[PDB]
């Protein structure tokens, strides 16, 4: 589940930030090309920092917990 704060991988071959984990800034539910907003640290050929992606084009890859079960 992609909430505000969860980091996800980018699966958009068009996005300069392919194969990189960004952070979800906010989720808009009204009708846009990318309901979920993602943030990055690097830039691209256009010189951007934040963009918008769809949840289906993102994978959840947060730092796993170091404690399966005691």
Curated annotation (Swiss-Prot):
Keyword entries, A-Z: Membrane, Photosynthesis, Photosystem I, Thylakoid
Example GO BP: photosynthesis
Matching InterPro entries: Elect_transpt_acc-like_dom_sf (IPR008990), PSI_PsaE (IPR003375)
Keyword Membrane: yes
Localisation per UniProt entry: Cellular thylakoid membrane
Keyword Thylakoid in record: yes
HAMAP family cross-referenced by the UniProt entry: PSI_PsaE
Free-text function comment from the UniProt entry: Stabilizes the interaction between PsaC and the PSI core, assists the docking of the ferredoxin to PSI and interacts with ferredoxin-NADP oxidoreductase.
Protein name: Photosystem I reaction center subunit IV
């Amino acid at each position: 589940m992609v909430q505000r704060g969860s980091k996800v991988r980018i699966l958009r071959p068009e996005s300069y930030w392919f194969q990189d984990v960004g952070t979800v800034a906010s989720v808009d539910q009204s009708g846009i090309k990318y309901p979920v907003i993602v943030r990055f640290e690097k830039v691209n050929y256009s010189g951007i920092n934040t963009n918008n992606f769809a949840e289906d084009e993102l994978v959840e890859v947060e730092a796993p917990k170091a404690k399966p079960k005691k």
